[PDB]
Every structure is written in C-alpha cells, then in structure tokens.
Symmetry: C3
Subunit: 598 residues, 3 copies
C-alpha cells in the first residue's frame, strides 16, 4: 500500500485534492494548502519526534511558542492562535536579545498573537523578575531594532501566578513592545500578579501608533516589596489607552499604583474605569526619555474616565538632565468623574484631582508646564479626608486653566506651608468652577485656597461658594512670603455675609499696582453732624488700596441712610456721601464689597 | 478495501497526516486535529443518523445550537460560529433552568457565539413571551449560578420576526446574560420586534465587566400592547454601552421606549446615536436591585451621545423598599447633543433634558439624588413644544449642578403647579448656561424658571438671557408656598429693559436673611426741592430688603440728575443723593438693578 | 487505483469523512465541508487550468479578487480573507458599472473583506484616476443599486503606490461604498498616495450606518497637481469616524488636505488624531447633496480629537442650488485639543478653530447656520502666526455659542476688512472663554475682537483678559459700517488699566436703545467750588449713552474725594456727587467703568 503510506504520512494532506465548494472556476488545491492558511500553537507544541505535547502545569510551553513566532516571522508574518480551553504555562527564560530584559517570549514583527486560551506563569518565576512578551531584540534598548505590526488580541488571559516580587529593585512586565510601531493589545485580561507594568509602549520616544483597547487589568500589585506600579506606560507618540478596566484590591496598590503614564506627544487616555489605585495618570515629559520624539510632551489628552483612587488623579511633571530640558504643554483633562475612596485622612498620598508634582529627586524648580485645560470634570472626596484638593500645586507652574468643573473636596488650591515654594504663573480659576459643600464645617483653621507659594503672577482666582462654610478661616489666603502681581482675585458675596475673613493678604499684597481684587468686609463708619447730604468715613485706615466699595447691608434706620457707595482718601479711610433727614453724628457697622480696579 | 473504509468513515480525517507548511520542526498531526481547532453550528445541525440538516423556516435549529453550546462548554469553552449566508430559525422553548425565563437558548460560561448569519424567530413565538439567549441556569435568579466569559459578536443579525406581544404582562428579551461576569455583545444587529429589552446585563447588582459595543437596535417596539421597553438594561457594576445605534419608527416607541438604563455603580453610556425613542437613559438606584453591589449607584456616566427623542433624555431616580434605601450620587452627563423631535405639544411625555422622576408608585419623597454634574450639553426643542424643559424637577432633589450647557426650549427649570411639591437642595444653575431663543414670543403666561417646589435651599440660579422674550410673565417665579433660604438668585439685565417682571417672589421670600438676590425693576422716585446735593426717595415702600440699587437708565435732563446708586430706609423706601443744578421737586421713573447682599 | 484517483482529484476532500472531536452526536461530514466554511483569495487566484498563481509585482490580482467577491455574493455572502505575508497587486481597471468611477474592484452586498496582507497598486495606475473598491453598481450613481452589509477589516494595508495625480481634474479614492447601508472599514492602514479621498461613505444622503474605526491614513497627498483632499467623506446619515489616525508630511497637504467631511445628519467625528493637514473637518449641508436624507444637516458631532493643522479645524457651511436650500443646525464641537503647527504667518490658509466659510463659488449670503455649541476645547497658535483666530466669521451666521473654551491665538473673533460683510445673529461668547497670552505684545494695530461685519444682532461678547497686552489697539472694535442692536458687549476691567482703548464703537453704536455695554475708560472731571457735598462733571460730553459709571481708581487726596459713582446729563456729561472737606474747584483724571443698561 504505497498510496496508503503517503496518505498516513505528514504529507498526506498534501495529496488530498480540494476545490472550494466544487466551484469549477476555483483553484485546484490540496487540503494541506487550506490548513496552511491558519496556524496555532498546536503546530509547534511537540516533542523531537513530532508528537503533540499536552500543555499543563508540568509542561513549559515557552520553547514551542517561540518556535511558532520564529517560523511565522520567517514567512512574512501572520497570526498564531493560542487555543481556547487550555492553559499554557511558561516556565523558563528566553534567550538572546530579550535576556537583558528578563524576557520570556520574544515578539517579532508582523506576527500577531490571538490569545483565546490562558497563559500562566509557573512557580519558576516566583520571587524573580520577568517580562513576559518582549519586542526588543537586544539587551541594550539603544541598540535594539524595531518591532512593527504586532497585535495581541482575543478573549484570553495572561495570569502572573500571584507571585510576589523577590526584591524591590526587580522589574516585571506583561508586554514590552519595545521600539514599537503599529502594535496593540486588545481584549486581553491581565491578572493576579505583583508587577511593575502590565504593558509598556515604545522606548524613550521611539515608536508610533501603539494602543491598548478593551483590556482588563486585575489585581496586579500584591506585596509591600513592590516599589512602584503603572499599569500601562506610554513611551511613544501617537499612542494611547482607550476603554480599559483597571482594578486593584491590595492595600499596597492604594499607595503605589497608577493606571497609566503618558510620556510622549499626541497620546491619550480615554473612556476607562479605574478602582483601587493610588493614581489615575502621570502626564510627564522626562528629559531622560526625549531621544526618539523630542523634549516636548504636547497634545496630551485625559478624557471621559471613571475613577475611584486614593491619591492623585492626574499628575503633571517635567524635568531636566545634564543636557536636555523636558517641557509639558497643550494638555486637556475633560469629562472625568473621579472620587477619593473611603479612607482615613492622611492614610494614603495626598488626595488631588490635579497634582503639580516635583521631579523624582524632589526638585520643584525644574518644571516647564503650561497651556493645560482642565474642564468639565467632577471630583469628590468624603468629608473626613482633610488631605483632598482640586489642585495640589507643589512645583513651579507656568500655566493651568480650570473652567466649568465641579470640585467637592477639602481644598480648592493647596500647597503645604513650609515645604516647597513654587513660582506660579498663569493659574486661571474661572468663576464657572463650582465648589461643593461636602466639607462644610470641617475647615477650622484652614483656607479654602491656601496660596503657599513663592509668587503668583498673571493668575485669576474667581471664588464662588454655593453654600455656607463658616468653619473656614478664609476663602483665600496669601502669606506675606508670596508675592502677588498682575492678577485678579475675587470673592463673590453669596454665602459670605457671616465670614470674618473672606480674602486675606498677609503682606498687604492686594495694594499692588496691577492687582485687581474684590471681596466682602465689615466696616465701621461714622458721619459728620450735618443735616442733609453728609459724609460717612471709616474708623479704620486700612483702605488706601480700595477704588470703590458698595453696601451689602440693609439700612434699619428711618432718620438717615449711609452711603450706598464709597471711595477712599489718602489716609486710608473710606468716604461716601449719605443723607441725614435729621442732623446728628451717626455710627454704623456695614458689610461692604471692597473693590480694587474692578 | 480496508483503508478505503476508514478514510470514507467519520474517522477518515483522523488518518490523513498533516504537518504545517511542511516544516520539519512542526507537529505531525492529522487533518481532523486541525479541523477540530474550530467549530460551527454545522457540526451539530444533523439528524439522529448524523446527516446534516439544512436550516430554513421549516426547521427548528434550537436543539442543535444548544447541543453545540453544551458540548463546547464540556471542553473548557471556545467559539461557535453561526455561519454566514444562512438564516437559522428558532421554533421551540428551551428546557431546564431557562424555562422560568421563557428561554430559548441557554448560554454557558466560556462559550462564545460568533454570529455571522441570521437568527430568526419562527411564528411559534407569535403572541408569546421569549428570551432568546439566557445565561441564568435556574428559574429563580437568586438560586442561579454565574455566567462568565461569554461573548456574542459578529456581523450577524437577531431578528424577532415582527411578532406583537400577546399581553402587556409578557416579557421579551434578546440576550439575558444573567449573573454575568466578563460578558459582551459586539457588532450584532437586533431588529424587527416587539420586545421589553434587547439585552440585559447582570441581575440585581450581581455581575461585572459586561459591555454592549457597536451594536444596532432597530424597530424593537411595534404595538400598543407593549407595556414598556428599554433596549439595554445594565444591572451590574463596571459595565456599559458604547458606540451603539438605536432606532425606532413606531408611534408607540415615542411614548414607551428608552434606549438604556444604568442601575449599578461604575456604569456608562457613551458615543451612541438614538432616534425615535421616548427616552435616552434612566440612571436610577432601585432599592429592590441592591443585593449584589450595594444600595448606592455612583460613578454613572452619560457622555457624547446624539439623540432625537420625544420625552426625556436622562431620568434620575432612587427609591426604597421595606428594608433598603437606594441612593444615587456622583453622576456626570456631558457632551450630549439632544433634541425633541417634531411633535405637537403634550402629544408625548413631557419633554426634558434632565427629569428628576418620582418612583414607580409615583412617590416623590423617597429620593436621595445628589452630586450630579450636567455640563457641556446642547438641547433643542421646536418652538411649538410647550412641554419642553432643561430640567423637570418632579421629586425631591439633594443636588444637581448645571455648568456650560446650551438649553434651547420652553422652560429652564419646571415642575407642574398643583402636582408634587419637591424639597430641593443644592440646585446650581451657573451663569455659563446659555438660554436659547427658539421659544421667544411663545411664553405668554409662563415663567422661564417656574419654581413650583415645597422649598429651595443652598441653591444658585444665575439667569442670563441672550435675546429678548417679552412674552414671558417672568424670568423666575417662586410661589408663596415655596420657602427659599440660603440661596443666590440673580437676573442679568441684558435683554430685560422692557420686562414688567424679571424675578417674582410671591411670598416676599427674597427678604430672607440668607437670600442673595439681584434683579431689574422699574422704580418711581421723587426728590426734595433743595438746590445742590438732594435726596431722591421711592414712592413705593416695597424695598426694605434692598441693600443697594443702581441706575440702568439714562438721564434725559440737564438741570438735575437722579442718584446713580441707592440704599434703603426702615420704611421700605429707596433713597439716594442726586444733584439739582437748579432747585425744584423732581419726579422720575428709572430702571434700577435691585441688589440684596450681592 | 480508482479510490486513489478520487482522493487525488479536486473532489478528494469530499470523500474523506470527519466528525468534530469524535463526538458521536456531531454531524458526519466530509473534510471539504469544513474547509468550505472559510474562503480566501487563494481559492480564486489561479490560472485557467486551476493551478494557483503566486502574487507579485508582475501579477495582476484584480480578476481573481473580483471572481472571489462575485462567487461569495452568489451564496448569500461571507468573508473573503486576503492572506497575510503576501502583497497582492492590482494592475487593471474593473468593468461594467464601476468603470464610470474608474473602479478597480466592485464590492458586493454581504461580502466582507478581511484584509490581513497588503494590497498595492501597480504602475499601470501612475498618473491615472482610480477608485480601488467601489460599491456602486452603475456608472450613474442615481441609477445605482445599494451596497448593504459590507465590512472591510483587518491588520492589512492598502498602498497607493506613491503615484502622483496626472491632472488636477482626476479623482482617486480607496473605498467608495456608494449608496451604502451598514458598511464599515476597521483597522486598515491606507498609505503612500496622491488621492482625493481614502474612503467615502454614502452618496448624496443615500445610505446609513457606515463607519470608519481604528484606521490609519498616512501620506495620502504628495503633489502640487492634487486639487483637493478629504480623507473620509461622510455623505450618509447615522454614520461617522472614530478612533482613527491621520498623518501627512507633504507641504501640499498643509494647503489642501482635510481629515474628514461630515455632510448629512446624525454624523460624528470623534477620538481621532490628526497631524500635518490643512483642515480638521468640514461640517456642511450642500444643497446639491440633499436627495437622500433631506436638506438639513443636524446632530453633527466633532468631539475629543487631537490635531496639529495649518489652516482651520472645523469649517461650517451651507449653500443653495436653483431648487434646494441647505441648512446646518444642532452641531456640537467639544473636548478637542488643536494647535496650528509651526509655520510663518500667512504661509497657509488663515488659521482658525472655527471658520464660517463662504460657499464653493465664494458667496457669503446663502448660509443658514445656527444652534452650534463650541465648548470645552483648547486651541493654540504660536506667537508669530498673525493669521490665527478662534473664529474666522466670513459668511452669514444665524447662531454659534462659545462656552468654556481656552483660545490662545492672535484673534478671538475675526473677519478681514474690505472682504465680505457678514450678517451676524446670535453669536454668543460667554465670559467663561479663557483668552490666552501667547500673542501678548504682538498685536500692534490689531483688535482682539475685530467685528468686520455688516451687522450684529442678538449677540453677546463678554471679554475677559487673563494677562496684559498693551500692544493691541482695542479689545473689541466695531467699524461704523457695522450695525449693532439687541446685543450685550462687556469688557472686564482686569489687566485693562493701562489700555487707551478697550471697546471701540466707530459709529457710536453703543448708544442703541437695546445695546447693553460696559467697558473701562479714562475720564477727566472738574468739580464746583462748594465745601461739603459737591458735584463733579466730565470735561468731555461724549457720555449721553451712559446709565452709570463707577471708579476704578484710588483717590490720592486727603482734602476731597471724587464721586464713587456717576450718572449722566442730557448734554453728554457725566455727573456725580463727591465731597470737599475744604472748598475749592477740583480737577482729576479717573479710570471709570462705563455702563449702559448693565
Ligand atoms: C528614564 C527611564 O529609565 N525611563 C524608563 C522607565 O523607567 C521608569 C522611570 O521613569 C520611573 O518611572 O520609575 C519606574 C520604576 O518602576 C521606571 O524605572 C525602572 O525601569 C527603568 C527601565 O528599565 C530598563 O529599561 C527597560 C527598557 C528594560 O526592559 C529593563 O530591563 C531595564 O533595563 C530602569 O532604568 C530604572 O532603573 C527602573 O527603576 O520605564 C519605561 C517603561 O519600561 C521605559 O520605557 C523608560 O525607558
Ligand atoms: C426590581 C426588579 O424586578 N428589577 C428587574 C427589572 O425589572 C424591571 C423593573 O425595574 C421595571 O423597570 O419595569 C420593567 C418592566 O418592563 C421590569 O419589570 C419586569 O421584569 C421584572 C424582571 O423579571 C423577572 O426577573 C427576570 C430576571 C426573569 O428573567 C423574568 O422571567 C422575571 O421573572 C419583573 O420582576 C417585573 O414583574 C416585570 O414588570 O428587570 C431587569 C432586567 O431584566 C432585572 O435585572 C431586574 O431584576
Ligand atoms: C455635489 C457633489 O458632487 N458632491 C459629491 C462630492 O463632491 C466633492 C464636492 O463636494 C467638492 O467637495 O470638492 C470635491 C473635489 O475633490 C468633490 O468633487 C469632485 O467629485 C465629485 C463627485 O464625483 C462624481 O461622483 C462620484 C459619485 C463618482 O464616483 C465620480 O466618478 C464622479 O462622477 C464631482 O462631481 C466633482 O465634479 C469633483 O470635483 O464628492 C462626494 C464623495 O465622493 C460625493 O459623495 C458627492 O456626491
């Protein structure tokens, strides 16, 4: 039986003819040709005699998956399926160029992985570093070639085995695409680990068009050893994260974990849900990462996300090295709904919607951050969380614009006294920002806008309360150490009638030539005796800076009326003309709106 | 011919050898192994002798599809293809655990359906209830196990046969995922029915990570019998609807159909287009649904949708049962563009962008709704639609914030007089909301903000017109039955010069100690005779509450000038100091901005 | 060997039995049946004897791909794979109905293309027109049938060969879906050409539910011959573009290329990144395109995009033909972050966030554009780019509303003097729009809001600076040729103290009966001699229109004080009552806020 021998051999399929649907005009093929149109791990998961090996906890699938990728790479590419209904364990390190990255599998250009089954790490990796899928082809990323056109997708799962880090200095990753152009991860669930990142895109600005979409990241920090975690790190331009789910349950994640970092221009983070993390996203130009795409991170978008976090939602930064200066500009943060989860005050990093963070070494005088728009977001922190702010402004800021947000937390603008002394320019807080009332009555000894800065210039703060909080010391306070110039600071009178202090300038900074200010105050006045039109003058002489003032109080009297409006005099008194129906010296205490140049 | 017999048998493929692309290092397989990597309905759509059966209107495909799902379930899962180019009819009910749900097909964990062809309901189902795909495994959902990792996707179609409901009490559904974790529907067209829902996600808070993406829902209500319709009902957290299309053509849909309901925390509805529906989305915490995820619906997002509807866009609610109280908070509604379609006034449910709706029994004193941000939306209703409002505020409200919207409809804030008397707290209407002019000249007898409430506290209404409408009775009216306290109510003077009434307080509520108000009014004044500085006093004594007023009128006179600014007196007169170049009693009628504590 | 003959024949696979996974309950099939479940180009890419032909630059694959589409069409449809690891060249025109469209491949209903490999145009097409994939079935689109349920998707590539246009009048396209219902392109990279469009959806309003998602468009203009380019043209309703990437590198693209055009109702452009283009999106109702969906483009959404462009971001338009009038309304532009790329002033079309453009023939008196909301966007242009505006308002406008944007460019509102004279209604510029300072000191001879119109009615401009720019001639200027009525124009005083001109009305238009205005000015006053309450009067008589004015200056004097507030007199003087502690004629120069009816 010669024909029998061929048919039963591995070339058997190549001798059975086939023509699509018996169509006379279709290609006369062999069964093997049609089967060759697809490829799976089963086609490489075999022993040296070619007998298929069943996957399992006792089998290391690494070499077989690598053989599949290497082969498909050699044919110009394709898509390898990792079959559903099986768990495929990885139990050794890869070799060659990915060894320097603690790599397991080496990705190759044009070779996609359709992961329908589960990929699981074996206990070999317990307490060890690892990067599961690596797209670099050299231990030195600077000498690595590119990875192009590599997509990982499916309904499958990458499971990191639950193993803790062995040492804080170790690094662990799921997918490092490397110097990556047109690469993506879609649909995959990454779970059950203690890792540094789940996915990294690009390398120091090298790369383009890399995306993470519709992925889940679940419980990826689990130990006190883990130094730091950011689930997706975007280090190439024209790249981003969309429609993903991020969840952590460990206490440690609330102190160290961030969902996304955006580190190059034209990058985005949109439409995603975050729970249990410390931080939402870093948006930062690191000078050390400026090689591939320049020293500017611009066109940065964080939009339409949903988050419960314990520290800061968006952290802005930029820094310098010996020879390069990083710049961050043209950022939009819009449409996000964010809360600080239930926690004790000071039990996690300081709660904030926006943080202007110092560099990794703690320097606050290196940053060049400007042209940032924060608009149409909602932020909430529970009433007990003292450490919650719309913005913690902890390093030099060259501009940030807030319009039409709803911020319901302890502070609006904050920086800790006796820490950094930021230089602030072009901070714009529009009157359309609504200040919520959750923290009313909690603010004893506190200033709602606590302006603990070296200096403030070209800034606008338009304070509008929407309910009373008589516990606060002031709506806005500038310590004497903070210079203030070419700025507009206003406090709307609504809900302020009973406040002893509204705006406080501890160095009398509101007297500056180009400071435009208005706020309520209580003023004692006394009139002359004259019947008829009669002047009223303030008893105090603290108003040399006031350009006009007007009454916010009713007049309980019949026989006279104080002035509706006032100007000042050289000695610092207010003066206006009221009316004595009957003569007599009058004395009244009136609530006035004090105005300077507005 | 022994070998011939084996090759022609069903085990024939298992005797033909194959090795991928003749690669010496690839697995030596059999053709059957490679074919076994995929699975379709054809592999189960056969008679008892194993002969394939062709689908068609005369064939019930249910048992075969169920057999396929049951089998793949037993192997740890996979994806069953429902082939393109065929219509597969379902013509009987399923059995076992899904019978209590009028179920047709029972879904099982890890078994995906790739629907490329059409699934059609046979006339067996005419006038009957049905739920086409059911993920519960018990008639009692409380005793049901979970459905996990079940995805339905493809370019295919579920067609409900056009059959009307037989009775209003019947229920019909397309996909009920059940107690559903990591389940989704993507790409599918659901059409041609009279159903209650197309898709339901979760059960009373049990479930997670369920999504509906890139689906179409077309003509899914067609009869007067249909009691109610919501196309997608999201009843588990961390779930949502994205990039879907919803269309109805029936008149009945304009009165009963909603596109989406969001009923648990961290849920979303984004980027979708709606036409022909009554309602856009319910966003509600039902106490009766609080078992799986708690009694709070928070982190609720409705964003970037496009809608033509006939009733209300977003309906907020919360309610209670004997032992549980539902709460709704931390909601964002942003970036939506919505219109009321062409219709006669009062011909469908009352038109609204936001509705604060009573509970199912009509109770308006059970709701706990707060921390809602409505920002950056546009709403339009044609000029004839009397029943159109930015917000219909019909039940107790604990807070809602409007910033930077464009509302072009009959009313801004409305509630019907002599219906409910809501208790209102923390209603914030920022001055950045633009009020359109489509309904100018239509408002005879109407108040633009009709404050028909029991009480209003800690609220802000900053009215800014952008064109004249002298037909309206007032910009804002508070009936004497509505208490008003700790609130700010302002009417900007632009386009108001000719209005007889701007703000109306029928119980003189603007006199409250912590009410901050400003609005224009016309006032008659008379001066004393004195040459020189001379007082002017109002003829009326209705101004005991005014803290200051200033002129909005020019002075046509040469020989005198009235005061630019006024205060009040104990008897309720305004008083200010003007100037008589020549003596004489003066009498003038002036438009003033009346101010209280602002 | 009779059995051998059958097995080796093209019917061989139809004689080898198969039963899925040896399941006794599965269908007893033949291998051919299972292989027949899929279909690829390999099944048709053969010679007349049925021998497979290898693709390559020397092989025209067109006829084979067409045969595949024609065949699958005949079976009710399916998905044809274009295999990965191969480049498939097209080298001739198609025949029949697509010839009138210079068509290569004719698409057919229900036949999807899964493009995993590359499709490349051969040099046959150099200097020639072409439309690669055409869904029309007639040379005359008006006589064409529909294309339904056609999806093109995959990780593959359409490469236009780099060939330049041969003549400016030629047209080139990638995918013309035609009269297209439920058609889409997903994941595909279109690159390396000189084309008119990459994708067109619909035809003159005929079509529905067509989408372009997750596609890349790279370097699709390369010559001075190319007349015009818009990458995706949306010409059917309920359709749009989402999550796409658009990049150009040619200088010509900066002058002629637009990323998207939206031309019918309920269409969108979202979540996309654009670099190197002239324009972002046209949003236009062309009367010539009103056949299929009506003469109104409404529910138009441009949201959450990222762009670097050289001309205009969003261009609005509508026009008329002999018998049809186009209307554009109900548009939202929100959440976009856009910059003008580095370029010399006037070196590309005039930079703008919004352009109200004239029609194709240059007519500016045909447009009906209204109910547009522009909110929560950021725009930046470098300081040297004189030709940069938030809005270039160059044709009649019936309404546009700006709320809560950040605009950092040369002009806010602009139209060139001595060009068109638009009639403007319902232009609303809310005070929540933040005006950036990049162009401070660059504005010599320029007006920030340059109101070069025939007339302005029912409009609001609330100017708020956030830093000083004393170079500008004025904040807002109306030439005498521009009528102004029923409008509100205000200039906030912050950063204006040193400006000689704030608001300028060259025809004294601010005196209109229903003009509501406020702005700062410097005024010289002189008092009478009288000790005590004493009048101050302006020296100039230019204030007959002023209803009130108040001091923006401090009083450096001890012996007297000028009035805090003023009204006017019939002769055009201001007058107020100040106070002389000691008698004497006083003379002062004061900065006042002039107010009319506000
Ligand atoms: C400036 C820089 O090194 N950037 C890295 C980036 O590094 C981050 C750093 O920005 C900071 O965020 O903290 C974390 C700590 O978790 C990172 O630092 C750690 O990792 C870097 C990167 O690691 C090296 O380079 C990789 C490409 C190799 O695969 C890896 O084996 C290792 O050689 C390391 O230099 C630090 O010492 C370590 O603390 O990380 C991103 C994402 O991986 C990378 O793109 C960028 O170059
Ligand atoms: C409190 C509650 O029952 N919630 C149901 C939800 O029910 C809605 C209800 O919220 C209201 O919206 O009106 C509609 C009417 O169209 C619904 O009520 C109708 O359906 C419910 C649910 O049906 C039962 O439970 C299902 C899980 C079974 O499959 C079904 O066979 C039936 O036993 C019913 O109790 C009402 O009497 C009926 O009027 O509906 C959602 C979505 O299905 C569900 O998740 C939730 O538990
Ligand atoms: C009114 C109109 O013709 N609309 C066309 C649309 O045409 C655009 C036009 O709106 C303008 O934008 O400039 C460009 C120039 O690049 C277009 O005009 C050019 O193309 C049109 C359309 O071409 C004809 O009709 C197609 C359906 C055929 O496939 C083609 O072979 C040709 O017969 C042409 O009439 C102009 O003369 C030419 O300058 O284009 C869109 C998208 O294709 C189309 O849907 C709409 O009908």
């Amino acid at each position: 039986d010669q024909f029998r021998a061929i048919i039963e051999s591995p070339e058997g399929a190549g001798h059975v003819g086939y023509q699509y649907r018996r169509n006379t005009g279709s290609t006369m093929r062999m069964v093997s040709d049609v089967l060759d149109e697809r490829v799976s791990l089963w086609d490489f998961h075999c022993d040296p005699s070619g007998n298929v090996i069943q996957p399992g906890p006792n089998v290391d699938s690494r070499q077989y998956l690598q053989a599949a990728i290497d082969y498909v790479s050699s044919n110009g590419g394709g898509t390898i399926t990792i079959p559903a209904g099986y768990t495929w364990y990885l139990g050794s390190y890869g070799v060659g160029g990915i060894a320097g990255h603690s790599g397991i599998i080496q990705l190759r250009s044009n070779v996609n992985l359709n992961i329908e089954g589960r990929i699981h790490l074996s206990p070999f990796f317990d307490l060890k570093p690892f990067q599961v899928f690596v797209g670099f082809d050299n231990g030195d990323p600077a000498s690595s070639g590119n990875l192009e056109n590599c997509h990982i997708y499916g309904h499958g799962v990458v499971d990191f085995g639950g193993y803790e880090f062995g040492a804080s200095s170790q690094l662990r990753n799921g997918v490092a695409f490397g110097r990556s152009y047109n690469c993506s991860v879609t649909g995959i669930t990454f779970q059950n680990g203690d890792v540094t990142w789940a996915i990294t895109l690009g390398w120091n600005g090298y790369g383009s068009n890399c995306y993470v979409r519709k992925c889940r990241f679940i419980n990826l920090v689990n130990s006190s050893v883990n130094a730091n975690h950011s689930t997706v790190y975007v280090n190439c331009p024209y790249s981003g994260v969309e429609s993903c789910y991020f969840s952590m349950s460990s206490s440690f994640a609330r102190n160290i974990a961030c969902s996304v970092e955006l580190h190059q221009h034209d990058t985005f983070y949109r439409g995603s849900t975050v729970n249990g993390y410390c931080r939402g996203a870093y948006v930062v130009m690191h000078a050390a990462e400026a090689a591939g795409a320049g020293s500017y991170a611009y066109n940065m978008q964080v939009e339409n996300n949903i988050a419960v976090i314990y520290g800061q939602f968006v952290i802005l930064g930029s820094d310098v090295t010996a020879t390069v200066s990083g710049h961050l500009n043209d950022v939009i943060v819009s449409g996000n709904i964010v809360s600080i989860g239930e926690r004790a005050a000071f039990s996690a990093p300081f709660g904030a919607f926006i943080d202007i963070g110092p560099d990794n070494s703690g320097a606050s005088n290196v940053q060049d951050i400007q042209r940032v728009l924060v608009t149409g977001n909602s932020f909430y922190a529970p009433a007990n969380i003292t450490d919650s702010a719309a913005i913690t402004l902890r390093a030099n800021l060259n501009g940030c614009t807030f319009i039409a947000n709803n911020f319901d937390c302890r502070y609006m603008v904050y920086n800790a006294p006796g820490t950094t002394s930021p230089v602030v320019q072009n901070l714009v807080w529009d009157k359309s920002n609504v200040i919520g009332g959750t923290h009313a009555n909690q603010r004893a000894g506190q200033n709602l806008f606590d302006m603990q800065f070296a200096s403030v210039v070209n800034s606008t703060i338009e304070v509008q309360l929407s309910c009373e909080d008589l516990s606060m010391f002031s709506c806005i306070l500038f310590p004497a150490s903070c210079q203030l110039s070419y700025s507009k600071i206003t406090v709307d009178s609504a809900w302020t009638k009973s406040m002893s202090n509204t705006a406080v300038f501890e160095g009398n900074q509101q007297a500056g030539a180009n400071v435009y200010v208005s706020y309520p105050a209580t003023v004692n006045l006394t009139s002359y005796n004259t019947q008829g039109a009669v002047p009223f003058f303030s008893t105090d002489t603290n108003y040399a800076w006031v350009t006009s003032a007007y009454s916010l109080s009713i007049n309980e009297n019949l026989d006279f009326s104080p002035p509706a409006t006032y100007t000042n005099k050289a000695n610092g008194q207010l003066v206006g003309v009221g009316y004595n129906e009957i003569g007599g010296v009058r004395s009244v205490s009136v609530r006035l709106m004090l105005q300077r140049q507005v």
